[PDB]
Amino acid sequence: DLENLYFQGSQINQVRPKLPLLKILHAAGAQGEMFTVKEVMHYLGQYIMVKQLYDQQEQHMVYCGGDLLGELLGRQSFSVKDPSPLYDMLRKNLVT
Numbered sequence: 001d002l003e004n005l006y007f008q009g010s011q012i013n014q015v016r017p018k019l020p021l022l023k024i025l026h027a028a029g030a031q032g033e034m035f036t037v038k039e040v041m042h043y044l045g046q047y048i049m050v051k052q053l054y055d056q057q058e059q060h061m062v063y064c065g066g067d068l069l070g071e072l073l074g075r076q077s078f079s080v081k082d083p084s085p086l087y088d089m090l091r092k093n094l095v096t
């Protein structure tokens with residue numbers, strides 16, 4: 001079966017975060033250095049919540065400037081409603 005052959009070894013699609021992103025994920029309670037992309041997104045959400053980087057009045061707005069997270073994103077701020085910067089950063093910082 002060619003569909004099985006294709007997907008064997010590629011059904012979970014684990015990634016290894018680059019060291020600066022791994023440090024963010026650990027800060028959010030993550031353990032180890034291999035994750036699903038879904039786990040990476042969970043821990044990034046949790047990081048923003050526990051470091052209080054979001055605007056209490058406009059909770060979709062993240063103010064990441066002067067945080068390691070803003071360094072990785074290359075941004076002072078972003079909206080979760082317009083997450084192009086997060087896509088860019090994860091493409092660059094998640095290995096295989």
Ligand SMILES: COc1ccc(C2=N[C@@H](c3ccc(Cl)cc3)[C@@H](c3ccc(Cl)cc3)N2C(=O)N2CCNC(=O)C2)c(OC(C)C)c1
Nearest residue numbers: 041042044045046048049054059060061062080083086087
């Ligand atoms: C209206 O207020 C909201 C609405 C949605 C999100 C959100 N939306 C989720 C989301 C957003 C964009 C992408 Cl590409 C993926 C997931 C996810 C998330 C995951 C990673 C990052 Cl870096 C930021 C947010 N994510 C969250 O992490 N949320 C989900 C809802 N409530 C929360 O406390 C946490 C949100 O996130 C805060 C952390 C800023 C706030």
